[PDB]
């Protein structure tokens, strides 16, 4: 049997809103460690890797390693019926074809019980080796989301170029070009809303902005986002899930 008690329900809500619009069908991996999800988009151009550790739940119990084939759209529907302060409880049986979601209001005398049908999945499991990247930019979530949205009005692709002074995002379309420049902020007092760069050698890669804007839906999860870049290797956009796991987006470059 699998039964997990998460009290910060908003988290899961947010998480699913970060996935429904990017990946349709998904394989949730439940194991003694926690939940791990890893899937590609329909075109095999990006990759989402979610990790939620059992150390983040109020009560986590796993018996057999379970592999749930879930439709993220249906799950997003079912989770929109949950409150941001609702305590969520997920459960499933070893030989089950359904996941049960129990939303408990803060002992409000209200209790929602949904039963989501599961499915059989013949997935493709990719191997992402741990790397050291040339450029690593830790910036505010809001500024990165801004830049992506903004440069989306100009063209569809963005040229991210990282160097020691700051990072610069460039776009070009039938109506012109855009160049946003973020400098390495030295906020002695404030930690968030800072742009810290860790460079090994300048990098300049071209990425699609549609998938970056898909990635930016996870902004409510973290106040900071970490971009990781190295020549000829995919881009890693990393959001931290409040000290219990991480959501990692990997995006293939252009040419």
């Amino acid at each position: 049997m699998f039964e997990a008690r998460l009290v910060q329900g908003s988290i899961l809500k947010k998480v699913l809103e970060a996935l429904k619009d990017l990946i349709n069908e998904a394989c949730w991996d439940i194991s003694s460690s926690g939940v791990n999800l890893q899937s590609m988009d329909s075109s095999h151009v990006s990759l989402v890797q979610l990790t939620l550790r059992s150390e983040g739940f109020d009560t986590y119990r796993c018996d057999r390693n379970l592999a749930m084939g879930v439709n993220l759209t249906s799950m997003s529907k079912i989770l929109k019926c949950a409150g941001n302060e609702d305590i969520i409880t997920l459960r499933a049986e070893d030989n089950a074809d359904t996941l049960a979601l129990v939303f408990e209001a803060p002992n409000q005398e209200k209790v929602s019980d949904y039963e989501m049908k599961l499915m059989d999945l013949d997935v493709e499991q990719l191997g992402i080796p741990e790397q050291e990247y040339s450029c690593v930019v830790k910036m505010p979530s809001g500024e990165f989301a801004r830049i992506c949205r903004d440069l989306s009005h100009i063209g569809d692709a963005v040229v991210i170029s990282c160097a020691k002074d700051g990072v610069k995002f460039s776009a070009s379309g039938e109506l012109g070009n855009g160049n946003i420049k973020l400098s390495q902020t030295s906020n002695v007092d404030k930690e968030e809303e800072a742009v810290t760069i860790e460079m090994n050698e300048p990098v300049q890669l071209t990425f699609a902005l549609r998938y970056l804007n898909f990635f930016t839906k996870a902004t409510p999860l973290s106040s900071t986002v970490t971009l990781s870049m190295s020549a000829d290797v995919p881009l890693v956009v990393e959001y931290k899930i409040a000290d219990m796991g991480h959501l990692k987006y990997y995006l293939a470059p252009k040419i």
Binding site: S43, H44, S46, L47, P234, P253, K254, I255
Partner: peptide, 10 residues
């Protein structure tokens, strides 16, 4: 333009 996430992982 535009590489699949393949080419790098297997």
């Amino acid at each position: 333009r535009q590489c699949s996430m393949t080419c790098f992982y297997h």
